[PDB]
Write a protein that binds this ligand. Structure first.
Ligand SMILES: Cc1cn([C@H]2C[C@H](O)[C@@H](COP(=O)(O)OP(=O)(O)O)O2)c(=O)[nH]c1=O
Ligand SMILES: Cc1cn([C@H]2C[C@H](O)[C@@H](COP(=O)(O)OP(=O)(O)O)O2)c(=O)[nH]c1=O
Ligand SMILES: [Mg+2]
Lengths: 204, 203
């Protein structure tokens, strides 16, 4: 009824989403909103994923895919609990990143979704488009920062946004940083003030 | 001589845990450790327990994945113990994962690709189940269903066939003392013939 809102930020690498989360966190009542990032590096799967992303260890595509997904499931209760307590979660990447990136590497879009099926359903999923100055920002320091791979990931994101069962909001890359900041700031506080009812389930 | 990775498999109520403890008592507690899957001390381990005892539900795909990730959380632990000379007695492993996922309808090939890369066991002891064991599956936990167990056994056999890993089936016709002694022996024998590096399962 007056639960917190579950707001997710999605986007390619270098889309500036991490920066947009900081902004929102700073422009909202401290003791009523938390930040949550995936992969969540404070767990064992989280550290294995950190080892894979930082080149210091390899795993088959399938295994990383499930590690990322299990990583999220470890927090399915944490998320649901916070929301029921009135705490709003600003989530950096969620099941959508998982599906987009897995499918970009070759996995089935639909099989991937069933692995995220049941996770707390976001109320809003803000996608930060990245222009060609941001797309070519991927020098390649982490394992997923190539150029045609980022374009294949972009395609998967599009398929999902075009399904329509999830309330997405795309913020054009063409806004000025100060405008982007105010745009997001207003839609987010709006979601916090009006969010009601129980926490739904994703893709079920 | 590194540690031997010895895995125990079998249907529900087959006496796995019992035999695994029998080994833990008859062998020098120092060079041997017990590892139980699902390892219920982790966050995924507890979600698995809640699923098994019907406290929570998840799609089949999610349960398959939790079990799998649950083993991967310990993939490094395992490999580090083997090389430090410690032998691992493991209650259920990758084989349980594929056998139970497939009985539910998953592709065995796909299931195996998720276990692909874990430390390869040096010996897998399969505890065959008799009528008494089979009948002990009365629905207490979510998979203890006689007819479901039968299809899990089909998956187990399918894997036994592939001449990949080293399997040993222990007859359900042996009595407790001879059974305990037999396993104690193939296990002791296994610990002392281990050579080469730790392999990779279905790589
Ligand atoms: C959450 C998630 C992230 N990823 C990738 C996105 C990034 O390439 C990498 C790190 O994500 P993240 O921690 O958000 O860092 P960044 O600022 O680069 O986005 O993990 C997946 O492949 N699958 C997933 O499920
Ligand atoms: C390891 C594993 C176990 N299981 C099931 C086997 C059992 O039905 C259940 C509990 O196993 P376990 O904790 O070993 O107890 P027991 O073998 O006596 O039943 O977990 C899977 O379905 N997949 C797996 O990957
Ligand atoms: Mg059981």
């Amino acid at each position: 009824m007056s639960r917190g809102a579950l707001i997710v930020f999605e986007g390619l690498d270098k889309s500036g989403k991490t920066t947009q989360c900081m902004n929102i966190m700073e422009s909202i009542p401290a003791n009523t909103i938390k930040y949550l990032n995936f992969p969540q590096r404070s767990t064992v799967t989280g550290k294995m994923i950190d080892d894979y992303l930082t080149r210091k260890k390899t795993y088959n595509d399938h295994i990383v895919n499930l590690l990322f997904c299990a990583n999220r499931w470890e927090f399915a209760s944490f998320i649901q609990e916070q929301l029921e307590q009135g705490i709003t979660l600003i989530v950096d990447r969620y099941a959508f990143s998982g599906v987009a990136y897995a499918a970009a590497k070759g996995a089935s879009m639909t099989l991937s979704k069933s692995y995220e099926s049941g996770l707390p359903k976001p109320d809003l999923v803000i996608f930060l488009e990245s222009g060609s100055k941001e797309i070519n920002r991927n020098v390649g320091e982490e394992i997923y920062e190539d150029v045609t791979f980022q374009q294949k990931v972009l395609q998967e994101y599009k398929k999902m946004i075009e399904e329509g069962d999830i309330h997405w909001q795309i913020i054009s890359s063409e806004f000025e940083e100060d405008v982007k900041k105010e745009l997001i700031k207003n839609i987010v506080i709006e979601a916090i003030h009006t969010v009601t009812g129980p926490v739904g389930q994703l893709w079920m």
